[PDB]
Write a protein that binds this ligand. Structure first.
Ligand SMILES: [Zn+2]
Ligand SMILES: [Zn+2]
Ligand SMILES: [Zn+2]
Lengths: 12, 69
């Protein structure tokens, strides 16, 4: 499966 | 490596079709949103109330249209 590099949940 | 959206990156806060659900375009749970590799598009597989019990990572997921080809 493929996902977007940017997501609402981002961490440092 | 660059962001999936290079045209609306500045407006990532806004909703854009390039990086959004193909039909509704909402973001109820993009982390659970699967994209078809052959069509390269997002599907309502996650927009529907009933969620999937497990999401395949090693096995690429294809939209029903691809399988019905
Ligand atoms: Zn975008
Ligand atoms: Zn949708
Ligand atoms: Zn497909």
């Amino acid at each position: 499966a493929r996902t977007k590099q940017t997501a609402r949940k981002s961490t440092g | 490596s660059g962001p999936s959206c290079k045209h609306c990156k500045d407006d990532v806060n806004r909703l854009c079709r390039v990086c959004a659900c193909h039909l509704c375009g909402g973001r109820q749970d993009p982390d659970k949103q699967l994209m078809c590799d052959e069509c390269d598009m997002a599907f309502h597989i996650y927009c529907l109330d009933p969620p999937l019990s497990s999401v395949p990572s090693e096995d690429e997921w294809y939209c029903p249209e691809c399988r019905n080809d």
